[PDB]
């Protein structure tokens with residue numbers, strides 16, 4: 001059967017921390033006062049919740065309220081405990097309160113509000129310097145949560161808020177986040193399709209923080225190459241084929257063989273034989289200003305099949321690509 005795997009960093013953070021830290025089911029939620037918040041406007045709806053812009057009438061400040069749908073109402077302690085554990089950490093969204101909505105009768109998480117600087121075009125007109133700057137900001141959040149024994153498991157543009165006017169970044173939506181325990185088998189049905197790591201696509205459950213680093217690599221490739229999304233799969237199976245057309249099938253088979261992973265036989269009729277492509281294949285006159293030898297070297301060290309061979313968030317922060325960023 002499958003060969004076991006463990007993270008090469010922060011392997012034992014949860015083991016040596018008290019059980020109070022990671023035992024989210026034992027956590028006692030302290031309930032705030034719903035009367036402090038007035039909903040202002042709908043910001044979006046997902047499969048398990050709805051998010052609204054709101055005002056805290058006790059201080060006149062804007063907040064964002066996530067109202068859980070009755071189905072996900074029982075599963076809130078994991079997200080609450082992760083948010084409390086990470087509160088105050090660099091670029092992590094702040095959980096301001098937890099109240100019970102009077103209409104839905106379900107839990108509502110109240111978050112810090114970030115001034116949005118429009119996503120219709122603003123995150124397409126980012127300069128090469130801005131890309132490095134914001135990528136370093138995301139790395140601070142990921143190294144922090146990984147150092148705290150938490151994997152985000154849903155890194156994607158929709159979960160990265162940017163107030164470009166104040167150069168402020170927050171990593172949001174910790175609803176899929178989980179505590180890392182070495183040897184634990186996790187659900188592979190996490191992350192959005194275009195950002196799923198090869199470990200999820202091949203059904204390898206013993207993954208770790210390095211899943212976030214693959215997702216970060218997908219984001220970086222899309223920004224520097226202006227190809228959104230970078231790996232544009234039609235479904236979860238075609239997603240792996242899209243990846244194999246870039247990284248090649250030989251390294252994919254080396255990966256599955258290393259961990260004694262048997263590929264889903266449905267891949268036999270779609271995978272084919274592909275060589276590893278050189279990164280300069282994706283460079284053209286319209287993206288060359290965002291590309292540099294440092295960007296390609298960095299991207300190459302994130303987008304690797306072997307989850308154990310990718311740069312960790314701390315190693316990524318040491319990379320030459322970030323030398324030009326003012327620290």
Ligand SMILES: NC(=O)c1cc(CNCCCCOCCNc2nc3cc(C(N)=O)ccc3c3cnccc23)cc(OC(F)(F)F)c1
Nearest residue numbers: 043064066111112113114123134157158160161172173174
């Ligand atoms: N490739 C690219 O195009 C791209 C695009 C972006 C921009 N993405 C914006 C996505 C907006 C999605 O809005 C969701 C609705 N609004 C809010 N939702 C919340 C949910 C929670 C929560 N559930 O935890 C908590 C708080 C808030 C919150 C708070 N203040 C205001 C509004 C909200 C960045 C990028 O990253 C980069 F790489 F660094 F550059 C790349």
